[PDB]
Each structure stands twice: as C-alpha cells, then as structure tokens.
C-alpha cells in the first residue's frame with residue numbers, strides 16, 4: 454500500500470508451527486541456516502529484540518534492524534526501530550526486507566506480508582513460541598524443495614516460498 | 620442465491636478426472652487425507668449414500684449429512700437429506716458446507732458450487748467413477764501447493780483452490 458518495499462517473512466517451523474523453545478531454537482540445521490544466509494544476504498533483517506539478543510551479534514552483509522519499545526536501546530552495528538512505521542521509514546528505498554522473527558515481530562508485520570519463505574520441519578518439537586496462523590487464500594506456492602537430511606542435519610524438512618496474489 | 624452458505628466441493632481426482640474404482644478410492648495418500656480433515660473440520664460434509672457407506676463411520680468433528688432417495692434410511696450420528704433443498708434447509712445457517720462426493724452427489728450440487736478444493740493427482744488410474752467436467756471461466760485459482768510425495772505417499776499431486784467470480 455503506502456510502503457514500497459516487498460515485505461518478506463523468513464521463518465522455519467515444525468509440524469505444529471513451533472519456532473522456539475526457552476528463548477532459543479529447538480533444532481540445529483546448519484544446511485537450513487546456509488539457505489537463510491544465501492536468501493537474505495544483501496537485504497535488511499527485521500528482528501524482535503528477544504530474537505536479536507539470542508543471536509548476540511550483527512549478522513554480516515545485511516542491515517540489522519532491531520524492533521523494541523525501549524527508546525534508549527542501542528546496539529553497535531545495528532539500527533533500532535520502535536514501530537512498524539519506523540521500520541518502513543528506515544527501509545523506504547529498499548527492494549525487499551526480511552521479517553526474521555520472532556513470534557511477536559511476526560504478529561506485528563502480519564498485515565503487511567507479501568511473500569513467505571517458510572521452511573517446514575517434519576517433526577513435532579517441544580516448544581513455547583509459535584509462528585502465527587495464516588490464511589493462505591490468495592497465496593500461491595512458487596517454490597518448493599526438499600532440504601538436505603544427513604548426519605549434520607538430522608530432520609526431514611522442506612523449503613517453501615509463497616507469494617501473495619492480492 | 621437463495622441459500623447463504625458457501626457451497627464448496629472437496630475432491631481428489633487424477634489426470635482423467637477419475638475419483639473412484641469398484642466403489643472405493645483408487646489410491647492411498649494419508650497426507651492428502653490429513654489435508655482434507657484439516658480443511659473440512661468444523662463444517663458439514665455432504666456425502667452421497669454410496670460414498671458414506673464405503674467410509675462406514677461418521678467422520679468426527681463435522682456434521683455428517685447423507686444424501687439418499689431412501690425415505691426410511693437412518694444412520695446413528697449422521698443426518699439424512701433426500702434433496703439439494705433439504706440439505707440447504709439443514710445447513711441454512713452454516714458458513715460453508717463441503718460436498719464430499721461421490722460423482723452423483725457432485726453432479727447434484729454442480730449448479731450451486733461457489734468454491735472448489737481440488738487435489739490433482741499426476742497419474743492415470745484405472746477407474747469407473749469420474750468428477751464431472753466444469754467450465755472454469757469465471758473461476759480464479761486462489762491457492763496452489765505441491766502435496767507431500769514420500770514412501771507413504773507414492774504419487775505426485777497438487778492442492779488447488781478455485782473461487783467463482785460470479
């Protein structure tokens with residue numbers, strides 16, 4: 454609408470939409486992370502404050518934008534926004550931005566998502582944090598591929614990309 | 620028109636519109652069945668008498684409505700209707716109803732379909748029962764996604780959803 458960048462979600466979730474456990478990731482898939490790095494590289498990452506602090510460091514090659522209500526919050530090598538609109542202001546001339554989680558930030562940007570890069574992990578983890586439900590009416594799957602399952606990547610998972618039609 | 624529920628078709632068919640063989644399903648896709656259960660949950664299932672009897676049991680979490688000309692027909696845990704209009708009476712205040720087959724019941728409700736949930740299986744099965752032809756002009760595809768193909772689900776198939784424009 455009023456904003457001009459493509460708003461993409463980047464997320465990995467399990468069979469029951471779990472994305473987190475005890476303020477961390479419930480699984481380790483190095484190959485899935487490499488897919489994430491390659492796809493997001495050169496584009497802003499929009500992160501909830503909690504998500505960012507668990508990561509602990511600016512992710513290289515991308516604008517790191519942290520979303521917080523804390524008006525005195527500052528991190529070296531990162532930009533801080535306090536609302537959806539402030540993100541939109543900081544990113545006004547960007548081609549595409551990646552909403553990178555976690556759940557509160559996914560909920561925040563849900564009315565604006567144009568494109569969904571969702572990895573689906575075929576396992577039911579114990580967890581406390583969930584990706585929001587989405588009505589996929591007027592969305593089309595434009596990419597799907599099986600993830601690498603091996604000794605280092607011990608679950609079955611698929612990369613999916615959906616694009617909003619309206 | 621005069622009825623106020625959305626009339627949805629729920630069907631799985633192959634390359635030649637085959638839906639049945641010898642009064643049963645020509646394939647076993649448990650993942651497709653999982654999609655069907657999730658999509659139809661909480662909404663009425665409208666089933667031809669033959670379709671229902673092959674299933675043999677009320678499907679849980681949904682109003683089971685059986686269409687038959689047999690005026691003395693009764694099944695515990697299900698409702699019986701004898702015409703399209705009687706189904707519309709039973710479902711007058713429903714949000715959406717799912718025409719669940721088989722072919723005679725799809726034929727019956729064809730003039731009233733608003734929405735199509737079609738699974739397309741990329742294989743040509745031997746069969747005797749077919750989904751009726753439909754002119755898709757004035758229909759828009761509002762969702763498409765690849766189904767899961769694996770050891771338990773040995774065919775390639777896609778979920779499609781179409782909505783009628785008029």
Ligand SMILES: NC(=O)C1=CN([C@@H]2O[C@H](COP(=O)(O)OP(=O)(O)OC[C@H]3O[C@@H](n4cnc5c(N)ncnc54)[C@H](OP(=O)(O)O)[C@@H]3O)[C@@H](O)[C@H]2O)C=CC1
Pocket residue numbers: 463464465466471472473474475476477478500501502503504505507520521522523534535536537553554555556557558559561582
């Ligand atoms: N599997 C996956 O794809 C991913 C998993 N995760 C997981 O998710 C979990 C973290 O998610 P979650 O707990 O939801 O936290 P978030 O990352 O969503 O961060 C929540 C914080 O965001 C800020 N915030 C929330 N709403 C607003 C608002 N309206 N305006 C301004 N700031 C706001 C607040 O910061 P403040 O308190 O400073 O005001 C809040 O504490 C972790 O387990 C993490 O590992 C995260 C990303 C991806």
Ligand SMILES: NC(=O)C1=CN([C@@H]2O[C@H](COP(=O)(O)OP(=O)(O)OC[C@H]3O[C@@H](n4cnc5c(N)ncnc54)[C@H](OP(=O)(O)O)[C@@H]3O)[C@@H](O)[C@H]2O)C=CC1
Pocket residue numbers: 629630631632637638639640641642643644666667668669670671673686687688689700701702703719720721722723724725727748
């Ligand atoms: N792949 C898929 O998506 C699906 C496949 N199927 C398959 O389809 C086949 C069954 O289809 P089909 O043989 O056409 O049978 P139906 O399920 O459509 O049942 C036909 C019965 O419906 C009743 N009926 C038909 N017309 C009317 C009417 N105008 N008024 C009142 N009742 C009516 C009659 O009941 P009565 O004789 O009692 O009077 C008739 O015998 C099976 O092979 C099944 O596995 C079924 C559903 C889905």
Ligand SMILES: CCc1nc(N)nc(N)c1C#CCc1cc(OC)c(OC)c(OC)c1
Pocket residue numbers: 463464465477478485486489504507508512552553554570571572
């Ligand atoms: C699970 C991966 C992931 N996959 C996908 N498809 N989208 C995402 N948004 C994320 C994510 C995330 C958050 C996240 C990323 C990380 O590496 C960059 C982390 O370092 C190891 C991390 O440590 C706590 C937490």
Ligand SMILES: CCc1nc(N)nc(N)c1C#CCc1cc(OC)c(OC)c(OC)c1
Pocket residue numbers: 629630631643644651652655670673674678718719720736737738
């Ligand atoms: C093939 C599935 C199916 N898929 C879709 N997309 N729509 C449908 N309307 C049906 C259907 C049907 C009929 C049907 C359902 C069943 O499980 C609930 C059955 O039990 C195993 C069954 O056994 C004889 C017959």
